[PDB]
Amino acid sequence: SMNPPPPETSNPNKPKRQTNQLQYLLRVVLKTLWKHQFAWPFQQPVDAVKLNLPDYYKIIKTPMDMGTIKKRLENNYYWNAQECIQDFNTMFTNCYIYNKPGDDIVLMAEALEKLFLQKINELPTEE
DSSP: OOOOOOOOOOHHHHHHHOOHHHIIIIIIIIIHHTTSSSSGSSOOOOOTTTTTTTTTTHOOOOOOHHHHHHHHHTTTTTHHHHHHHHHHHHHHHHHHHHHHHHOOHHHHHHHHHHHHHHHHHHOOOXX
């Protein structure tokens, strides 16, 4: 029922880069999803205590959220675009695992994921 430590956003001995694709992931993809009317549940780690979801971190063992992704992008935490794309996909998948079809939170994730897919479709060639 207690909250775990959040995913790391800093790690000096992890190799990292700022590729043009990673720049697009921050300036286009994250920016588009972050400003959306449905972004708010995804802007920080799930607080299982305040939300009274004591089973959340029993079911979701690889948590991810856009607050973490934002900090990772701002901190140049990633080596490549695939790592960041995986974080977005983990975030959406976690929501679909924990919740059920038609739940408000699932409808919100679906709207954000549609925009994610539209933006990823125009990911530039590396570089």
